[PDB]
Amino acid sequence: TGDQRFGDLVFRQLAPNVWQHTSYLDMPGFGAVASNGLIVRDGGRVLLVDTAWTDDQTAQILNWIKQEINLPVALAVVTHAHQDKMGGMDALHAAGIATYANALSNQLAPQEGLVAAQHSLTFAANGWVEPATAPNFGPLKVFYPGPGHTSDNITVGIDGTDIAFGGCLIKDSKAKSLGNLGDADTEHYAASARAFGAAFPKASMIVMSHSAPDSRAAITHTARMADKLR
Template identity: 30%
Template sequence: MKNYFYSIGVILLFLITVSCKKEIDASNEVYSSETLKLKQLTDNVYVHTTFLDTESWGKVACNGMLVIDNNEAVVFDTPSENKVAKELITWIENQKKATIKAVIPTHFHVDCLGSLQVFHHKEIPSYASLKTIKLAKEQGTIIPQHGFHNNFELKVGKNKITCEFLGEGHTKDNIIGYYSKDKVLFGGCLVKTLKAKKGNLADANVKEWSNTVNAVKGKYKDAKWVIPGHGNEGDTSLLNYTIALFKE
């Protein structure tokens, strides 16, 4: 009996150690400069964080998602500045030896497509919702090259990423990205980090925001990681928090 409890204890200790190691590994910062931070979240997914100077909010940290699978990469949301986009592209190509297959802005704000021209100059195709393309044209910024209606799938390596518009919230055009292999959901600015305030509502549909995130939660029930547009990533509790924050 004593040996039995000892064995159980060893197994539990092993499981706790593996779980903690997984959590620690998932938060590893693999690159850091004054303008760009890269954190490895899973085997194939990274969070790229850059910084945007704003009049209302000061210096804001902005997240994007990077998926690298079998030496192919897809970037969700660009840095706002061209020089930082070059820094990100250099890291992907030189350090990961990956070819960037696509860049996907999740809505029309500068923290999503501000440096698209750098990707275009490198002959990296850009894909966005037709709503995003329309709004980008209206504000006179650089325009994504290829448009889709509400859904778009793209193969990266041996797996696929999904882009989808499920309703308005932060903007009229906000989409989410999902990498099914690692069960990572990129919510972008549609999703808030825990304890965040409502933030920039200039182009928001506050009345629909909760409904939209609730639709995301219902469709992507198997998501293990959720990346917001600003702040720390987490699990689906970020979706619950955002729903509650904007619920009327």
């Protein structure tokens, strides 16, 4: 209740200027797998965090934004090189939206069959984005917590809100497993999850890629699950 639908996309307002977008991918015999990203209104422009699974779904996000917010989308940041986060890059570029990703995400994108972002983010030794690579990001605070779900995963806090986005690094606090595959770094995952928590220590709403928003318990639960794999 309260969620909005546009085509195959679902939108949930999380704060006066933040919405979660959800798109679905069918796994035959398994049903639809959800993927979440964020939409942020910053003054007279919109900033996008992650695409949908496909170009067509990403176009649905852009059309919902035009219809319900009616402000130009200035830039998009994508949080790693998997289809649920970068599958719609072509639709962003066609719309004239400037796209940003971790340099490593852009390097990985071709071998994954994905389109790289136009701009590469780089990071200081303490994990915070180098500001020259993230110009005019407004309230978006971009942090690289270390290798976890993937080597390239990045995370984003929204200044002025209680919201931080853990991407696929953080799992639901009720998760029964981490879902780590070959590209997860299971030696460092627990520390990376805890580093995300420490980078956004006041965030009380933790948005993640594959479950509904949770409390900080998602961070501590994820780190505990990851402790078991070291």
